[PDB]
Amino acid sequence: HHHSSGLVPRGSHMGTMVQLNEAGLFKSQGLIGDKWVDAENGHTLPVNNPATGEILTSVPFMGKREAEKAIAAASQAFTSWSKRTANDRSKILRQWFNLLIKNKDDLGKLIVLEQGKPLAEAVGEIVYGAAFVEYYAEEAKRVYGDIIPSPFPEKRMLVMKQPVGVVAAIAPWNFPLAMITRKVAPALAAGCTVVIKPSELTPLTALAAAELALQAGIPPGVVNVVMGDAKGIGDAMLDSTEVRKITFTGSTGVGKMLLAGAGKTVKKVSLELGGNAPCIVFDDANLDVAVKGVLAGKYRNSGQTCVCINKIFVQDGIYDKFAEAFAKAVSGLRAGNGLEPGITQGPLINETALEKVERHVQDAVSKGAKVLVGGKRHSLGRTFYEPTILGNASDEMLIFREEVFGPVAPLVRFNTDEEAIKLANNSEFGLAAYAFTENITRGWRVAESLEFGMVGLNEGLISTEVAPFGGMKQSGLGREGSKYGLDEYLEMKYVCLGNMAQPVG
């Protein structure tokens, strides 16, 4: 126990890790049924702080066998959980919501430690992610069935909606809490059980969330958390006949593979895949609203969101004023450790993410783009990249065609409204899109014309639990958030009663 003893590795932010551990929120095991568990062979994978390079802890490196045990625990728990009243599940889910909010400051710090975003953004993610738990606790009691007028006098027709069964959920690293709750909350609300595989890059927040679910009275087996061999876990989820639904948020390539694999057992599948959000700034945009909106929509989480602005189309008349004011706004951003106050840009998740950003910037500059701000690795090193604006961008550039997932904003000049809309709609992406215009007719027209699941009109921050989020075309299937998000975890049942009598008098 002497301070020189090396059992707990000494390092930066040890005070924060001790406080998280004293709160019961610092886990180094997965959760299967009523036990916190190691992998069967004791293998582990490290979780590192992307801002310092230091070890936080190791988590199990699980695979097929552990995922099968998690699925069996969820299947066993489903019978009782699904037969509880909606009111009973709602009270328990509200207890989980209250615990997430009560522990938001510590949970926010855990997101900073493993993912790197600024603390204000991490605490905001706890409020946002917990909002799905509250929303679906309320919505659990509003799974309404129907009575349909029957065209046959002797028959009566009903529609019931019942939980689908065991859900397999796979989440990415960019929102380590909100991506878990967006999937787990509606599934539990409907009466499903879940086996969730968080990103191996950011698993600690999912484990803290599951510890708080247990404290809330969520029975063992209703929530299970496994990680490690993502391929092996995914195959166990796809091969299981008890897994009736899969939900995935992540890369397009992995999502397409999961969709293809789900076909052999006819699972219900909902996915949110890569986006490439266009943003159209028209001549009649309110300049301050457009600058503030694009700053927020582009550089939130250092550009590492599914809905982030990927390319900005600026109309010829406002181009110079927008480029100047947008550059001034971006120059105010500051990169660093998310646990330092005043920091507004965190590091990119890993070296692969940084290499992609550099590839996009190099390609654009080679094809004629002008670096108006940034355009290089930050002086801090590691995976910090300077917030960048690339003027005179074009449809031949890699950043125009593909998702950069980094703090780079390319500007494309355009002449007519019809030109910008047709260009925005000319891709296989269909997640978020944005438009800035003060005119009622133009605003409504652009919002209707855009072939995207979500449109911000004079708004750069559109994320909410109350509205349906998801993609069109190759950006996804199904929706998350809103009353419709719950339908993904239910099966409709038509009941036809026959030999019915006519009413009397």
Add this chain to the structure above:
Amino acid sequence: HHHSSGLVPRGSHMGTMVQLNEAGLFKSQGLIGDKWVDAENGHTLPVNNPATGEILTSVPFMGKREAEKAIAAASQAFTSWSKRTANDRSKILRQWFNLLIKNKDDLGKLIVLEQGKPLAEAVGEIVYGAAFVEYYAEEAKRVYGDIIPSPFPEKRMLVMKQPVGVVAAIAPWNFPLAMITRKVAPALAAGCTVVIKPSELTPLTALAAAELALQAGIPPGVVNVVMGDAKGIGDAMLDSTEVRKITFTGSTGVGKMLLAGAGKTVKKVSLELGGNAPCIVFDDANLDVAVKGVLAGKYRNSGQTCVCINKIFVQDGIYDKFAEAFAKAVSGLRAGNGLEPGITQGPLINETALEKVERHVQDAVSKGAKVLVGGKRHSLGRTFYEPTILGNASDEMLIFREEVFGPVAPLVRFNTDEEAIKLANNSEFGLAAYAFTENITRGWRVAESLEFGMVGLNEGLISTEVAPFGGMKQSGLGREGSKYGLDEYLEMKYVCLGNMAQPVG
């Protein structure tokens, strides 16, 4: 032109084919855009009458190239069709509904000629199939968006619902009209265009329906009909990025293959696959209701429906009375040509279907089943099979585990309600299920407990356009019929308006 001339092959039912041809409903070409077309190489496939073995006509044997041209015509027509008002599409769809009903007697006779069901059942299928056209003509004007209370004072939140795009539809042979309209009507109502591939066994009814769609004012390219190389057409539909949604009704193996193939372009997929419907006759069932209901639910279309009763669980106390009265009811059925009045059983579609029925009957008899009625090929030969009841059936028999798709009813004795429900729910099928009980509590309990998309409670005939039809588990994805059927052909869009002001005073 002398009566000895053989240009038109002479045969039975030539008067009916001449009347269909004079009505413009006897087609021997596919439909791509504004042209009725042959296959590019002039290859064809014959359409034969299953009751007589005679040729009706030949249709084109199309493949990849023709399906691509059909997809391009649908894509070109989509821009204008999707931008019409819902009221405009509704008037045109109602004109199509009225033409289907006006021509129902001739259209019913065409279904008899190619598929073989009795004429009363074929005319009933026209009324039922046309009912989807009427339903979605009305529902087109009820695609409601939402205004959601925003938790941000400065934002307003809307949900719009817009057509998905080009739809590829694949239909089976058992309901040659109703399977086309169940898919085409909601797609057109939403504002989609369609490329439909009917079964090569029963394509003439789909072509007659498309001729009437053109007469109704449905523009060229909005409905396209192709047939021939089902594998090649299916691959063209799956490989096309303009096809945004696929809808399939048919075998589980083909449906699983299509689901897997759709993954690579993230298409929206809805399917109705094989069913294996259990029917539970409890001790307190009204005997007459159960006998009449099982007769209708089992032998409609000679057992060749997705929702047909496949296995009957009869409680110990009512077993002898049910078996006796059910045998008497089945002995009244009569097999023959569907154009002869008094005929209530048509032939099985082909020799493969007859071999499967014989395989199921042989397997059951080998494992101890008792032939109470039928159990052999009908004296008419061809693919006519005698309506059959097999007593003392068990869970080890092929007919219990798999879909017979023929006029064979196996009876399984059971002791307790819990035993029957657990047995009914112990399969990967989840389409239709049936139960007969006079008790309120038992009836509601069995209806809630059954893991099937559709439950008939004291009802053997549950089919309707007003209720959602589809499967749970490996029997399907999505629903057809009802307001929910239209959601399969729409994409939700969340629009967030920002920089909004507070109301005044």
Add this chain to the structure above:
Amino acid sequence: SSGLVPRGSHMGTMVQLNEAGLFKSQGLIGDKWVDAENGHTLPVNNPATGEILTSVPFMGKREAEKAIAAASQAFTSWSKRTANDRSKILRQWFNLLIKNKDDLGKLIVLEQGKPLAEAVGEIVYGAAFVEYYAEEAKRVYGDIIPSPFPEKRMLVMKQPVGVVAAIAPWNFPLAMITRKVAPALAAGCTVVIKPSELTPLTALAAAELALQAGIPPGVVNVVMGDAKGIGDAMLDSTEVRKITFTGSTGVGKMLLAGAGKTVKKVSLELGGNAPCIVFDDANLDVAVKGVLAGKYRNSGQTCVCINKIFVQDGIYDKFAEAFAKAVSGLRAGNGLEPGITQGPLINETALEKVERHVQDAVSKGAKVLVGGKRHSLGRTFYEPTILGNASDEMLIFREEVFGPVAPLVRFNTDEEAIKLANNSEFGLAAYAFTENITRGWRVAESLEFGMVGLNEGLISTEVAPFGGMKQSGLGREGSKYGLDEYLEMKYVCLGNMAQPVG
């Protein structure tokens, strides 16, 4: 001198209507077209010519009671039909109204006076309610609610209320009948409808076509004459479970008060006093075209007409000039004459109210920019008028003119105009013209009115809920919600229920 000496000046049109079976001189009670019990009648006159078209019965309490008994008897069978069965019959009625729209439009012109284009438009609009509720009849959905008690299941059914008594005004002689009768019949109710004694012929033609469509006798009954006596029979009857009324605020308030003693469901649309706000950033052409249509439709005789226009200081002069040019293009005359865009006011009382509003405004400082006097045609034709320099002290600002007079009130700030628009006991329609998305949405949310046209002067549709807030009404007509006025909800709780198995 030999030859045909007609009594009226549109005999050819009346003969064509009569050959089509659409010119009636009797009411409808059950399976009979009937006269009043004493044979008394009232004349129906053409407001453009002063000529009698025909006489209709002058019925009262006794006939209304017989109509109520016929509706009550027919209700048992009509309400127990499937929604699909009622829907087919209502669609047959819709198709007949559309098939006969040209003749029916001419009948509206003859008895009410509006231009033929507007009258044919009213047939299309009024028939649209019949189509809408034929479709909606099959979408009366009940609910299954998750029960917090494991042993109970909870359902909501929606069933027809019963016999409906409907009272309609003269300004839309068809659309006011169908917007009440169509949802009532769709739900499974029966109706006893009293059209205005000024325009009863279109209601009777509509009922003849309902009978042709297969609507059974007694499901639709039409009575007219002693409006007070008929109204009292409707309020005193316990079989009348719901009252629907469109018309004056004073009569509506009296009916609401009277309905209380039998706890009837009541829905009404009363007087409106629609403000229209033209902001500085309005598209001038859209505002001029919209205000012209919203104000002068039916010569200003609609409860959604623009009654007062608030014009922002920066656009005032350009708007006043372009709006005067547009109003000067309107043409008054007989509605059967091509090119006519303004018909006569319904009667001398309506004209006297318009003259009272114009002389009050001029006495308090208003400037007559256009019109301001009786038209050269005489009778009840009034020149389309614009009154500049209007104020909140004027009778036209405080009360519903129901005539072709447009007062313009200058304003400075958005907040000033909105607070002024919201400072009355009216709450039916309101209008606003602005190109800005934030201002447009803000004004639409802020307005304390049931209906708001934003860059639109013509908002009427069967697909959206129409009705008033404050003293302008109760309930809504049009849209899915319009059907709920004719339905009673029923919560059914099933007990002693078992838990699902496995």
Add this chain to the structure above:
Amino acid sequence: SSGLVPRGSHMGTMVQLNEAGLFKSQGLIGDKWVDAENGHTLPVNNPATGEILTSVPFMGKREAEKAIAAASQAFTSWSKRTANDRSKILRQWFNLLIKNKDDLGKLIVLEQGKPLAEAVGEIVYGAAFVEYYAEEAKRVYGDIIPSPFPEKRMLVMKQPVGVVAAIAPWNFPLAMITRKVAPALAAGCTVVIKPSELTPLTALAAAELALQAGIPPGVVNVVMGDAKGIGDAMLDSTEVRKITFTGSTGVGKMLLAGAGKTVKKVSLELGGNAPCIVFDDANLDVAVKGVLAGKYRNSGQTCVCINKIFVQDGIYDKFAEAFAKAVSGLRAGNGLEPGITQGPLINETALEKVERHVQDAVSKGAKVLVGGKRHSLGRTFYEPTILGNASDEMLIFREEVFGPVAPLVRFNTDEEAIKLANNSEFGLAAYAFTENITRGWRVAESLEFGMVGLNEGLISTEVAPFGGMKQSGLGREGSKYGLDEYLEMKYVCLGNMAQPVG
């Protein structure tokens, strides 16, 4: 003799309520707890002991006007908060009601008299409306309707009606307050509520907890005293846009009539006369348990209580015997005593009505099977009674007894019982007991009542719409539909709209 001489016999309970801040002797107007303007008061007595608990103000017109002005002033800010903001505050109120449920239940026992188990149950039930509408506040969804005009877009918004005046009865001193206040506040309305002068203390405790929850001053106001004078101030105020009432049919009809002159939205729940049909194939134990609970809850003082029981000929003798055995197990007394299942009737007028119904039935041939007289405890305790050989000529069959008397009417056919059940002007609750699926669904559909218990005697819930048909009411309370009573629909039509691109 030294020692504490209390005025009442439950001083320990009153001291505990007072230490919890839940024992009030003033009304609430804005940010002040107030007396009447002249200092006049009225006593609130314990119905089991006759003892005064405390006095409350005897307010009238002036105080009600001040309460309305406070609600009107608070409405501007409360209605403009986000639904999420109102929801958090309403959930804080729900949590405080539940946290204080044991003390609040005891307060209901003291002023109304029901057993403590029922009073604590009423707190859970009444607080459930607060939770329900806190959740529903965020689900006030508007619509986007497909427009038949290419150049127009159509929206439906739903916005709070304004100041609500709520009048509640004495039989559920908390649940009748919250079922009106919770949806009103959730929608964004403000309220002026007048509890019954017989049971005002629970409403005042509920308002104290609303203030503790962060509900701003003026959003909830509580006044009592001159019920006629307060009611007239509520009806005469133009700022009161909606009235909600639960109570007697005569008072409700008067309020409905009075509301007409300002066209207020009105919802009410009036007297019921619930039939209960026990068919031959009923499960006997379910029927006996259900009828016992449905009839004797609150000693029969609920508007959903079973008022008359129709028993089919084949089950009559078995039902009468088992139902008599179950009724004999009921125990009358002070609600704070364990084992007590029947409390006293509210006052001597309530008792006199029960005695009038029992002597009328006995004079017309009814047989007293159990009870039929004042309880040995005296005061307003009446023995639980069963009257066999009842008929349609008896006062208890025609009118609401609101007491622990169960008349049994023998019947032969299902059609006879249903037609008899439907032959009144009441339409609140009805009950039926049958094991058969076809008969059960048929009776549930046929009954002309707003609520039907099928094999269930206890149907009350916040999740389902509750209210009457015919003369038993207007509007519904509970469920998503209960919130629509506090909202005004607005159709917004956007014009000059463009076609989408590509």
